[PDB]
Structure 1
Amino acid sequence: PWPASLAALALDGKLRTDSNATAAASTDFGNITSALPAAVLYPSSTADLVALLSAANSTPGWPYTIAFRGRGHSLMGQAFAPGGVVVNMASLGDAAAPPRINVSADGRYVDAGGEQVWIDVLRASLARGVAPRSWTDYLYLTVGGTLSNAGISGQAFRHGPQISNVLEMDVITGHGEMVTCSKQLNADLFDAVLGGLGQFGVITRARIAVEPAPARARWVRLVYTDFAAFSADQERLTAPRSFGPMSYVEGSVFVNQSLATDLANTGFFTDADVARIVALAGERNATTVYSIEATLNYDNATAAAAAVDQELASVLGTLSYVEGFAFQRDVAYAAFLDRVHGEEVALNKLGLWRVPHPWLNMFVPRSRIADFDRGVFKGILQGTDIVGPLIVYPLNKSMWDDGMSAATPSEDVFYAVSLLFSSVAPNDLARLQEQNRRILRFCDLAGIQYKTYLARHTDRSDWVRHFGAAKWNRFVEMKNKYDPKRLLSPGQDIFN
């Protein structure tokens, strides 16, 4: 039997089972795994979501797991619902009204539908002179999606991840109940959902903190051939004072084998800059080159430009990059934030976007980042053709709320390490997958207490270790309370 409201969804053509629908909801950015759902729901309102989850909750024997597809940027099927129902969240934003994104009248925050993509949140905010404070390097991800993980970028060292910049949310639990939550109201659900990997319910609305929108960003890159100086300077630029001047701090690792091409492909360096760095590498006989990437946001004030210069000069004076290897650019804030989009367009035209992405993402405690550098950047990765950026930068644990579901290392400072390998070569996938296993293996044997990010484990003991035994029990308590039938986001392979 079907509850009337559920059947109504089918009657309205919102519940599709046609191959076209199921197929589109069966692959993800990872392009490594796939799983066909039984059906796909195209909700036109949150009420439709209530109908589905309510049916599931009251219908004894309900056999359909439910996933919430934002844009499907998952790497290993976390957004799939094998033989179940995949919710096409984007459908909530089809109507031209009411708006799915509203900047508060006082301009202190911005309400956004869980299905909205950050790029649109940005535009709507800027139209009101404001903008979120914490981002992701790539803006075409949904609010609910990044919030179910963490949401990190170069601003996280000072503002914390995106999950630390949410005032409240509207969530529909596995029981089918629409609940508003925050630190004050239904705090247990609030904490569970942030970094919750879609296990407790679907986020239909997130109240995001904002700040007055800067107009421009002085964008700089500093080059190093010495990892010690490189990491010491990143830690200096992101150290708690309150934080330094820098609005954003990330880093890059370039292996010597493809140095010229990788530098040229940053879209930041000129061919003249490239020649100099290539020469530097040969002079130091380096197998790896490192580059800090930072920015200083400022506005259109008449004195801004000159004020930024002095500020920048002061900071640079405290660092240790190779003499003369500071490279500057100045762009509009929105241009900087949406910088990766151009790379997507280019890669797609080359047919190098819709390829397997065996990405390795993790948080590495600062005390062992040097060992990681030796074992991976100067070791395992040497002698291979690398396609994709190798991102490395520190984060401050103090800006992370350990009460939330997201898992992080115990040290006060830990690094976000993102090796974005693209399997462009023929069947070069199997090799990259083995390489990632080797890297993880190296870390386990060296005793490095890392945490994976954006990865889904397939063994219960792995998830228990991921969260930590005690934090795991809390995760389970929240599971039994909000999704007792264990139907939500089965692709995480936690309770499925």
Structure 2
Amino acid sequence: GLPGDLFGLGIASRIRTDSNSTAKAATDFGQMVRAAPEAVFHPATPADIAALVRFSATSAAPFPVAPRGQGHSWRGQALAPGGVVVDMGSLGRGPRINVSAATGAEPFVDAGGEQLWVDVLRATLRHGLAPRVWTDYLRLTVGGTLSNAGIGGQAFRHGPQIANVHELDVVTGTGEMVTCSMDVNSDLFMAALGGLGQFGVITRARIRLEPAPKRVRWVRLAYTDVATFTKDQEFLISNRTSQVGFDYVEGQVQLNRSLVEGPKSTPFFSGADLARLAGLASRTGPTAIYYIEGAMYYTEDTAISVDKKMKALLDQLSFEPGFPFTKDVTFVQFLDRVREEERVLRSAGAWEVPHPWLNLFVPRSRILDFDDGVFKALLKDANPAGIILMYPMNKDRWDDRMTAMTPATDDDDNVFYAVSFLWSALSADDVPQLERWNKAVLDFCDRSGIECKQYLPHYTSQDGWRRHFGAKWSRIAELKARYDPRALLSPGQRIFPVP
């Protein structure tokens, strides 16, 4: 398949073509799309990636090049059939994380694009520092999350991970190695952030740091009314100057059947907690339960001072009386919480299964309309495995010059919701029902005039991508022609046909 001359290059020592190597890069976390590459490239350095891209870009028969982080995508975005998958992890041979915490300057961490957020955390904590914004799952690459946005419970306060980047090193689709920031090569910098790997491979990101907390008081608050739940989440993300507040705000939607016919316990909830929650979800007939998840960071504070701070905050809220659930953990245990959930799921054989996931950004003005059509109509009697996340964010912390898309509103409302259907098919036979629900959600939004934006989007036609990027589409197409003229990079995104 690949050109013969590729195997004569100095980088050919890092090209793996054995079935065992290529199979490891043929599927992703979704477990639905299978497309083996011709080879897997294991670069020792970012210059090796530039040499591979340059070879393809100057060849008679250009071939696709797709960087692969952890493969935590579910629609074949990291696959390169007919091409080469770049195993980014190879760049991590030796030391790839440098923390600059010298007195008389703003501290930062330089991390390879292949580096996992869990490894960045480990390195910065040794200096009493940490990045400000985290995804829920730390075994994701820096380059992988920055190519999307990187959202989590702190984004309402500091913006997505793409809003917490000083500069990048990018290997463009021509094989050029560019350093970019707000002040130098800003067109590439803004394009690459939420850019879905279309303009180049991120090989380095300089991440913003803040003093690290030591411990976290972590709560889940149960609500039976979506209007009360949303009013409280919006209150919690809207008093950011007040000393009484959470550092992290998320939420979860638990469908009635998912509680009643669910597990005996979870890593967060005991059997007794779950028995009480099932009672709450059926007191006046069957209801879903909406949980607010809040976390309060602290350092040297005594147990009794934290109790008082949490009480002052909880005392302002309207969750069901007697339904606060509290944990007190280290900062690392809090940020790495999903690793424990993964351990439990893998032991049950419920992790390495299909994940036909769907992530939406919904305008605040339509969130109760969304709830009515999706959770109260379409999914009221559904019992999907997995989780459903629901939480609001602030548009004022997102930079709309970056590629990443947020909902557009006529009244420029600052609040929008992230709604994530993270459902899993315990059996691959459950996939069609989940995909039918995904399409039904999108169809409901279309019929209702609810102008959502998919997050981690996937479209198989340029029409879908033109609607997704809206006002930014013309600039995106122009930057694409400049930075990846042959449309070699991450072709599994399906945004640009090969010219």
Normalised by the shorter chain, which TM-score bucket? over 0.9
CA drift at 1:158? 0.5
Distance 1:6 1:217, change over 3 A: farther
CA drift at 1:165? 0.4
Summarize deviations over 1:45-65 as a string: whole Å, max 9, x none: 111111111112222x33311
Provide the rounded CA distance (Å) in 1 between the counterparts of 2:313 and 2:264. 26
Equivalence for 1:93: 92
1:70-109 equivalences under 5 Å are 70-95=69-94, 99-106=95-102, 108-109=107-108
Contact (CA 8 Å) 2:170, 2:204: kept in 1 or not?
Answer: yes
Question: Which one of the candidate residues 330, 333, 339 is aligned to 2:331?
Answer: 333
1:394-409 equivalences under 5 Å are 394-409=392-407
The residue type paired with residue 297 of structure 1 is Y
Summarize deviations over 1:382-413 as a string: whole Å, max 9, x none: 22221001110001111111100001102421
1:93-492 equivalences under 5 Å are 93-95=92-94, 99-106=95-102, 108-242=107-241, 245-260=245-260, 262=262, 265-299=265-299, 301=300, 303-410=301-408, 411-425=413-427, 427-468=429-470, 470-492=471-493
Provide the rounded CA distance (Å) in 2 between the counterparts of 1:68 and 1:204. 10
Equivalence for 2:495: 494
Provide the rounded CA distance (Å) in 2 between the counterparts of 1:26 and 1:420. 22
Contact (CA 8 Å) 1:248, 1:296: kept in 2 or not?
Answer: yes
User: What is the RMSD of the two structures over their aligned residues, measured on CA atoms?
Assistant: 1.7
Provide the rounded CA distance (Å) in 2 between the counterparts of 1:359 and 1:6. 42
Provide the rounded CA distance (Å) in 2 between the counterparts of 1:277 and 1:136. 27
The residue type paired with residue 52 of structure 1 is L
Summarize deviations over 1:123-179 as a string: whole Å, max 9, x none: 111112111110000110000000001101111110111000000011111111111
Provide the rounded CA distance (Å) in 2 between the counterparts of 1:241 and 1:121. 26
Distance 1:4 1:83, change over 3 A: closer
Equivalence for 1:26: 26
Contact (CA 8 Å) 2:137, 2:339: kept in 1 or not?
Answer: yes
The residue type paired with residue 326 of structure 1 is P
- Scaled by the length of structure 2, the TM-score of the pair is 0.94
Provide the rounded CA distance (Å) in 2 between the counterparts of 1:348 and 1:417. 25
SS in 1 for 2:416: strand
Provide the rounded CA distance (Å) in 2 between the counterparts of 1:477 and 1:171. 18
Contact (CA 8 Å) 2:117, 2:140: kept in 1 or not?
Answer: yes
Provide the rounded CA distance (Å) in 1 between the counterparts of 2:379 and 2:428. 19
Contact (CA 8 Å) 1:76, 1:455: kept in 2 or not?
Answer: no
- Scaled by the length of structure 1, the TM-score of the pair is 0.95
1:21-60 equivalences under 5 Å are 21-59=21-59
Contact (CA 8 Å) 1:149, 1:196: kept in 2 or not?
Answer: yes
CA drift at 1:315? 1.4
The residue type paired with residue 183 of structure 1 is M
Provide the rounded CA distance (Å) in 1 between the counterparts of 2:99 and 2:424. 37
Distance 1:185 1:75, change over 3 A: same
SS in 1 for 2:76: coil
Contact (CA 8 Å) 1:233, 1:319: kept in 2 or not?
Answer: yes
Q: State the percentage of identical aligned residues.
A: 55
Provide the rounded CA distance (Å) in 2 between the counterparts of 1:486 and 1:4. 19
Provide the rounded CA distance (Å) in 1 between the counterparts of 2:69 and 2:109. 19
CA drift at 1:6? 6.5
SS in 2 for 1:421: strand
The residue type paired with residue 221 of structure 2 is L
Provide the rounded CA distance (Å) in 2 between the counterparts of 1:264 and 1:360. 27
SS in 1 for 2:9: helix
Distance 1:67 1:153, change over 3 A: same
CA drift at 1:263? 7.4
Provide the rounded CA distance (Å) in 2 between the counterparts of 1:216 and 1:423. 35
The residue type paired with residue 489 of structure 1 is S
SS in 2 for 1:220: strand
Provide the rounded CA distance (Å) in 2 between the counterparts of 1:231 and 1:37. 45
Provide the rounded CA distance (Å) in 1 between the counterparts of 2:435 and 2:312. 44
SS in 2 for 1:292: strand
Provide the rounded CA distance (Å) in 2 between the counterparts of 1:113 and 1:6. 28
The residue type paired with residue 388 of structure 1 is G
Distance 1:426 1:33, change over 3 A: closer
Distance 1:264 1:398, change over 3 A: farther
Provide the rounded CA distance (Å) in 2 between the counterparts of 1:337 and 1:6. 45
Distance 1:160 1:341, change over 3 A: same
Q: Any stretches of 5+ residues in structure 2 without a counterpart?
A: none
CA drift at 1:242? 3.8
CA drift at 1:310? 2.1
Contact (CA 8 Å) 2:252, 2:290: kept in 1 or not?
Answer: yes
Contact (CA 8 Å) 1:38, 1:85: kept in 2 or not?
Answer: yes
CA drift at 1:305? 3.0
The residue type paired with residue 104 of structure 1 is S
The residue type paired with residue 472 of structure 1 is W
The residue type paired with residue 346 of structure 1 is V
